[PDB]
Ligand binder design. Structure first.
Ligand SMILES: C=CCn1c(=O)c2cnc(Nc3ccc(N4CCOCC4)cc3)nc2n1-c1cccc(C(C)(C)O)n1
Ligand SMILES: [Cl-]
Length: 260
């Protein structure tokens, strides 16, 4: 078994319908990797398509400091395995949860730094004519003096040849729900805005109903902390009903409120 042979299992760091993810040390180089191990999905199924989007996403992407690095992927024992960079700070979701537990928080300064860094990742992905389509706190990973990296490329698709498996409904732009895929990069921007709103301490986001529509009308959820009217205005325009009014990733990373 390549998995057993090449790696030693240290700790389970994820589990779900996707299988499990393990912190592993690679015997040859002594480095830590995050390795996802899943039942090989039924051929011609949602999970296979999702799985194919991820491998073929790296085929295009390669390497960037704000995208979780991919090293290898293989299949054995009717399981599939993908070997990714290990980010020692867990996901933004874990960090948000821990903030609530010990009652800490991300400074506004740190919200802007999160926005800029994930923005740089998106700028790169979009420049390769791809879109992530599942930006949310659980898919942003932290290396710790802090690097935010975009992970979980299973929903990644082409801009020009749009093939869309919808992301989490809590972070999903209305136009994607309306099967309008003419500006998918702006759907990532919408989701990033709500991701920062979660980090800023907002209540849990709605999965549907009134509050869900209220957000897609361009109204931010309640943020309990003191954010400048200017940083707020940036987050508001990022969830603009009209996706063409939302800034692109490249406009985002060059925005004044973010510099630097
Ligand atoms: C290889 C799979 C994707 N993935 C990375 O590329 C990837 C890269 N880095 C870390 N670092 C890290 C993650 C959690 C912890 N915690 C340990 C204490 O309990 C709370 C979780 C610590 C480190 N994780 C990564 N991944 C990971 C891990 C778990 C779930 C998932 C998904 C599939 C999105 O649900 N992904
Ligand atoms: Cl666009």
């Amino acid at each position: 078994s390549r998995y057993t042979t090449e790696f030693h299992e240290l700790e389970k760091i994820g589990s779900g319908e996707f299988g499990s993810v393990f912190k592993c040390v690679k015997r040859l180089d002594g480095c830590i990797y995050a390795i996802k191990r899943s039942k090989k999905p039924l051929a011609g199924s949602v999970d296979e398509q999702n799985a194919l989007r991820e491998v073929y996403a790296h085929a295009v992407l390669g390497q960037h400091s704000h995208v979780v690095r991919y090293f290898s992927a293989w299949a054995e024992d009717d399981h599939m395995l993908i070997q990714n960079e290990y980010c020692n700070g867990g996901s933004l979701a874990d960090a948000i949860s821990e903030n609530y537990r010990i009652m800490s928080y991300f400074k506004e300064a740190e919200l802007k730094d999160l926005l800029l860094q994930v923005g740089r990742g998106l700028r790169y992905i979009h420049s390769m004519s791809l879109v992530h389509m599942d930006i949310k706190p659980s898919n942003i990973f932290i290396s710790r003096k802090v690097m935010f990296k975009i992970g979980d490329l299973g929903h990644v698709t082409r801009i020009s040849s749009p093939q869309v498996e919808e992301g989490d409904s809590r972070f999903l732009a209305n136009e994607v729900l309306q099967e309008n895929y003419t500006h998918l990069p702006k759907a990532d921007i919408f989701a990033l805005a709500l991701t920062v709103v979660c980090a800023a301490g907002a209540e849990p986001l709605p999965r549907n109903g009134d509050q869900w529509h209220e957000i897609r009308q361009g109204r931010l959820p309640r943020i309990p902390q003191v954010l400048s009217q200017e940083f707020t205005e940036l987050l508001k325009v990022m969830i603009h009903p009209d996706p063409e009014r939302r800034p692109s990733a490249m406009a985002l990373v060059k925005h004044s409120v973010l510099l630097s």
